[PDB]
Design an enzyme around this catalytic site. Structure first.
Site, PDB file in Angstrom:
ATOM      1  CD  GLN G  56      -3.061  -1.278   2.553  1.00 26.33           C
ATOM      2  OE1 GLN G  56      -2.462   0.240   3.489  1.00 26.33           O
ATOM      3  NE2 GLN G  56      -3.455  -1.839   2.258  1.00 26.33           N
TER       4      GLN G  56
HETATM    5  N1  LIG Z   1      -5.563 -16.402 -10.254  1.00 27.57           N
HETATM    6  C1  LIG Z   1      -4.250 -15.864  -9.539  1.00 27.57           C
HETATM    7  N2  LIG Z   1      -4.161 -14.927  -7.952  1.00 27.57           N
HETATM    8  C2  LIG Z   1      -3.069 -14.877  -7.807  1.00 27.57           C
HETATM    9  C3  LIG Z   1      -1.952 -15.579  -8.130  1.00 27.57           C
HETATM   10  N3  LIG Z   1      -1.224 -15.251  -7.244  1.00 27.57           N
HETATM   11  C4  LIG Z   1      -1.211 -14.018  -6.274  1.00 27.57           C
HETATM   12  N4  LIG Z   1      -2.477 -14.375  -6.818  1.00 27.57           N
HETATM   13  C5  LIG Z   1      -3.817 -14.131  -5.657  1.00 27.57           C
HETATM   14  O1  LIG Z   1      -4.048 -12.356  -5.202  1.00 27.57           O
HETATM   15  C6  LIG Z   1      -4.125 -11.914  -4.497  1.00 27.57           C
HETATM   16  C7  LIG Z   1      -3.466 -11.573  -3.882  1.00 27.57           C
HETATM   17  O2  LIG Z   1      -2.550 -11.309  -3.438  1.00 27.57           O
HETATM   18  P1  LIG Z   1      -1.496 -10.836  -1.715  1.00 27.57           P
HETATM   19  O3  LIG Z   1      -0.069 -12.404  -1.554  1.00 27.57           O
HETATM   20  O4  LIG Z   1      -2.792 -11.439  -0.876  1.00 27.57           O
HETATM   21  O5  LIG Z   1      -0.763  -9.189  -2.355  1.00 27.57           O
HETATM   22  P2  LIG Z   1       0.008  -9.562  -1.545  1.00 27.57           P
HETATM   23  O6  LIG Z   1       1.061  -9.586  -2.282  1.00 27.57           O
HETATM   24  O7  LIG Z   1       0.100  -8.853   0.114  1.00 27.57           O
HETATM   25  O8  LIG Z   1      -0.394  -7.857  -1.407  1.00 27.57           O
HETATM   26  P3  LIG Z   1      -1.450  -6.676  -0.224  1.00 27.57           P
HETATM   27  O9  LIG Z   1      -1.325  -7.718   1.259  1.00 27.57           O
HETATM   28  O10 LIG Z   1      -0.434  -5.569  -0.249  1.00 27.57           O
HETATM   29  S1  LIG Z   1      -3.119  -6.754  -0.683  1.00 27.57           S
HETATM   30  C8  LIG Z   1      -4.598 -12.808  -3.599  1.00 27.57           C
HETATM   31  O11 LIG Z   1      -5.842 -13.115  -3.531  1.00 27.57           O
HETATM   32  C9  LIG Z   1      -3.646 -13.816  -4.269  1.00 27.57           C
HETATM   33  O12 LIG Z   1      -4.250 -15.575  -3.836  1.00 27.57           O
HETATM   34  C10 LIG Z   1      -1.746 -16.269  -9.547  1.00 27.57           C
HETATM   35  O13 LIG Z   1      -0.506 -16.540  -9.597  1.00 27.57           O
HETATM   36  N5  LIG Z   1      -3.236 -16.972  -9.768  1.00 27.57           N
END
Ligand SMILES: Nc1nc2c(ncn2[C@@H]2O[C@H](COP(=O)(O)OP(=O)(O)OP(O)(O)=S)[C@@H](O)[C@H]2O)c(=O)[nH]1
Ligand SMILES: Nc1nc2c(ncn2[C@@H]2O[C@H](COP(=O)(O)OP(=O)(O)OP(O)(O)=S)[C@@H](O)[C@H]2O)c(=O)[nH]1
Ligand SMILES: Nc1nc2c(ncn2[C@@H]2O[C@H](COP(=O)(O)OP(=O)(O)OP(O)(O)=S)[C@@H](O)[C@H]2O)c(=O)[nH]1
Ligand SMILES: Nc1nc2c(ncn2[C@@H]2O[C@H](COP(=O)(O)OP(=O)(O)OP(O)(O)=S)[C@@H](O)[C@H]2O)c(=O)[nH]1
Ligand SMILES: Nc1nc2c(ncn2[C@@H]2O[C@H](COP(=O)(O)OP(=O)(O)OP(O)(O)=S)[C@@H](O)[C@H]2O)c(=O)[nH]1
Ligand SMILES: Nc1nc2c(ncn2[C@@H]2O[C@H](COP(=O)(O)OP(=O)(O)OP(O)(O)=S)[C@@H](O)[C@H]2O)c(=O)[nH]1
Ligand SMILES: Nc1nc2c(ncn2[C@@H]2O[C@H](COP(=O)(O)OP(=O)(O)OP(O)(O)=S)[C@@H](O)[C@H]2O)c(=O)[nH]1
Ligand SMILES: [Mg+2]
Ligand SMILES: [Mg+2]
Ligand SMILES: [Mg+2]
Ligand SMILES: [Mg+2]
Ligand SMILES: [Mg+2]
Ligand SMILES: [Mg+2]
Ligand SMILES: [Mg+2]
Lengths: 163, 163, 163, 163, 163, 163, 163
Positions: G56
């Site tokens: 964020q």
């Molecule tokens: N369809 C799909 N979804 C993915 C993949 N890799 C990660 N995600 C999905 O995308 C969403 C975001 O991943 P997330 O790990 O929660 O974000 P972040 O990198 O931690 O960043 P944040 O915490 O500031 S929100 C999640 O719902 C996760 O399950 C992928 O390879 N394919």
């Protein structure tokens, strides 16, 4: 002077009949063997102590109590029953791998040869995979417990492995 | 008084058959050797302890567990199999370069000579590159494990390298 | 009282026949000597312990195991074989240069004199270069192992070099 | 009691064959010598430790690793190869000027004399410029490694330069 | 004399059935394995101690408690289930990278071969990427836990990696 | 007694295959080498410790971490790839100018000779500019990692540069 | 033996999912990362200590607290998000100019390749200006944290930059 034997096989084979044809000389009526029968029979100045056991699927798991101190084994197979010759092969290959029966002599009574559809001792020797035996002496005899044929020729072979 | 041997080769060669022709005197039916067999055979007041092993490609990588304390090696080659004589050459030239088998005596059983298309021991001696051996005693004998020919003439040569 | 001997030579010479003509008194049928034979024979209150070995090209490299503690050597040469008298000369001149046989007495059995084409002991003495021997006692005797001629006259000479 | 030797020469000369004719007594099949072979041979109560090396143009530059502590040198030259007698002269005149081989004894095996077109030892002595040697003892012998001729007469000369 | 084993795989594979076919000899009715079962089975004078565990997604994360001191692993794969062969590949490639199972022997039971749509052991060997294994011994066997086929041939291979 | 080696080359050459043909004896399936593999192989009483590395353009810049304490180098070149023989020349002329590899021995495995369009070792010796090497020993061998040809003849040459 | 890593990127990329796919092996449900997560994962005898942080806009200014003593960085980029590839370029070019990350290794996980509209790793390599990197090692891998593809191939590359 003494010898211990374990008669085993599937259900319907002829174990009890063989035992009480050797011991009494008569063909007795029979009931399924739930427990065990034990009888001493004398021959050639030797006293064989035979333990006949059940062949029902539920008792085949209790044979292990008797493997110990067993000097010979007698596997009885019904020749007319050509549909269960594979199950007998499984049982025998399992019981040949046990370490308590490591030195035991193997004898095979191919019983019910009086029946017309009976299968030869060589066909059984092939179906049971008996030539695959290498750690053990073995022998196969064709019998008819109702007539006594081939029964005193098995105890005669078991004498070879005395003491 | 004692001697340790390692019987090896490709699949289908005749190792198990040779071993249980020396030990029992009879030709047994055979199953592929996944694990290992070990048997002691006496001859000329010497007790050879032979270790027969698998030749499948997956077990050829487990032979190293047995190289240690091995005083003789018996390489069995199928003569009728004239298409895999190069693979056997690879295996043997690899296993001659191992340092655990540095003093081991080499014997070669060119088996399956009873077959019409069998290849002579000299043709095998040429194809296997046996004259190239210089750090080791070696010998090649023509056999027929089903008939026992040439089997007791190999244990006789292995006696030369006793103690 | 005791004496150790090593009988050697090329293949086909007559070593085994000589040994079992001295030991048994009869002419035995023979097989190629892959390993070794050892036999004690008594004569003149002396117990000779003779070691007969193979002459095949593959066993001529294993004679070294026996050179040690050897008090006499018996080189048997086939007289009828006039085409391999050079190979025998090579073998003997090589084995005369070994330091383990430094004090060994040398005896030469020119065997197969019963054959018409046999070559005299003097022709062999010239072809083998025996007069060139200077660090060693030596002697050459003409034999016929099938008839025993000249065999007990070699053990008689070996007695000269007792203790 | 001990002596160190370095066998060298061009490719195809006969170095490996000479070495394993002295050590084993048999003519082995050979492969080009990429690395090096080392073998001890006993003669006249002396244990020569011979180092046979490669003669390919790529290994002739690695001989320097062995010059040190070398008490004798054996230069093998193919007599039938009359087209490379100049290259051998270059190699030998280069290796005679090295200071690590300053006291080394020089022996020359003019090998392959069994071939009809072979050139005499005097023709080689003239072509190699051996009389030009003045800081060194030297000797030339005519050989045939396949038959062993002249091989034990070189080790005999090398004994003159013991200790 | 002793050996520790870990049977693992996906849900529905046949782990519990295999274990209680080896231990009892009969095909038992089964419930999903939430916890773990542990049983000792004797064969070839060796006492294997097998730990069967759950394959549900929630228990696949608790297998780590058992990796320690594990000498062999048995990965059971349902052959009829051709839609989850990728998930099994993921699980196995993850568990091959763990350092506690660094020396463990790998065996693969391709079970449910009695079903018509079953896939061959070579098709599984290709789909699972088993040839990619290089730090580990491995082996694949085709089984039928309901009939016992191929089960005693896996414990036989595990014996190769004893001690 | 010990020796350190660095196997390098372009992508697709055969480095991993060579390494696990020397170490295991079998041809493994392969994945691109992102990191590094390290394996010890024994031969001629010497324990070579080989480090196989990636050839992708992104990993060719990480080879420098391994130059230190490296006693030999093995440059593998695909002979069938006649379009990238210039890139390999660039890489090798760059890595010959590094001061950490100043004394390293150079060996070149011209691999994939089993392919029909393969280019000879002399054509490669000319294209790679190997005769231009003057501060270093060097050698080129023709191989076939799938069959093992020429692989044990490279470790044999590397022994020349021991200690 | 040890290594410290910092996983960073924009919001929605896949950092937490990658971390708990490496650590647990399962795909967890996720909440926005306001603080930080830290987890140790073992692989190839190396214990990576990964710090996943928020993406964020309000937390991107707190990453500086973690730059210190960081040996590797993992920049995760959502490939489906083709509208924010410029913002990621800004963030990465800003964080490459920091002096605390002066020696850090750079790895780029182009995640969400399972989606149809995903953009190739080369298109990302061009859009992110990765070839412009000159003071740093770098690498880009295509992943799918939900399936684990490409995740263990990044930790494998990070091992190249150990110690
Ligand atoms: N369809 C799909 N979804 C993915 C993949 N890799 C990660 N995600 C999905 O995308 C969403 C975001 O991943 P997330 O790990 O929660 O974000 P972040 O990198 O931690 O960043 P944040 O915490 O500031 S929100 C999640 O719902 C996760 O399950 C992928 O390879 N394919
Ligand atoms: N016609 C015929 N019947 C035989 C023969 N041998 C045994 N039997 C008969 O087959 C039947 C089964 O024999 P039996 O001895 O009771 O089985 P078992 O071996 O004891 O096995 P179980 O006790 O578990 S039922 C019996 O009716 C017996 O009389 C034979 O040679 N010919
Ligand atoms: N016709 C013939 N068959 C032979 C001979 N020697 C061995 N065999 C046969 O060839 C077959 C293979 O022999 P076998 O001993 O089982 O192979 P192996 O050496 O043990 O190798 P494996 O266990 O990995 S399958 C067997 O059927 C055996 O009986 C022979 O001299 N003549
Ligand atoms: N006609 C004739 N035959 C002889 C004589 N001496 C030995 N032989 C015969 O020559 C043959 C070879 O003798 P033999 O003793 O078997 O060879 P060897 O010395 O033992 O050598 P080998 O064992 O390596 S084959 C035999 O058939 C033997 O009987 C002889 O004086 N006259
Ligand atoms: N006809 C004949 N051949 C000989 C003689 N001496 C050696 N050779 C043969 O010549 C060939 C070359 O001998 P060899 O010992 O292998 O070469 P090298 O000296 O070791 O050199 P290299 O190892 O670099 S190839 C061999 O086939 C060998 O048998 C001889 O006196 N007569
Ligand atoms: N038809 C057939 N069924 C088999 C075979 N092997 C195992 N099974 C059957 O498949 C079912 C699943 O086997 P089971 O042993 O209970 O699963 P699991 O490996 O223990 O995994 P779980 O405990 O997490 S549910 C069982 O009903 C079992 O009897 C086979 O070879 N043929
Ligand atoms: N037909 C043939 N294929 C070979 C030969 N040697 C190696 N290979 C094959 O060529 C392919 C590439 O070999 P490989 O060892 O994986 O590349 P590398 O040297 O490790 O380089 P990389 O890891 O960066 S992809 C493989 O499929 C391998 O099996 C050969 O002699 N003949
Ligand atoms: Mg009954
Ligand atoms: Mg076998
Ligand atoms: Mg004889
Ligand atoms: Mg040579
Ligand atoms: Mg279960
Ligand atoms: Mg590679
Ligand atoms: Mg997050």
């Amino acid at each position: 002077k003494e010898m211990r034997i374990l008669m085993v096989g599937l259900d319907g084979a002829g174990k009890t009949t063989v035992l009480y044809k050797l011991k009494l000389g008569e063909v007795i009526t029979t009931i399924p063997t739930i427990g065990f029968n034990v009888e001493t029979v004398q021959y050639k100045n030797i006293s064989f102590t035979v333990w006949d056991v059940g062949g029902q699927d539920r008792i085949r798991s209790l044979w292990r109590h008797y493997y110990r101190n067993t000097e010979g084994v007698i596997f009885v197979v019904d020749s007319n029953d050509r549909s269960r010759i594979g199950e007998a092969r499984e049982v025998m290959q399992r019981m040949l791998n046990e370490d308590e029966l490591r030195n035991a002599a193997w004898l095979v009574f191919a019983n019910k040869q009086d029946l017309p559809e009976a299968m030869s001792a060589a066909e059984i020797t092939e179906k049971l995979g008996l030539h695959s035996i290498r750690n053990r002496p073995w022998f196969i005899q064709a019998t008819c417990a109702t007539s006594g044929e081939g029964l005193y020729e098995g105890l005669e072979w078991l004498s070879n492995s005395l003491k």
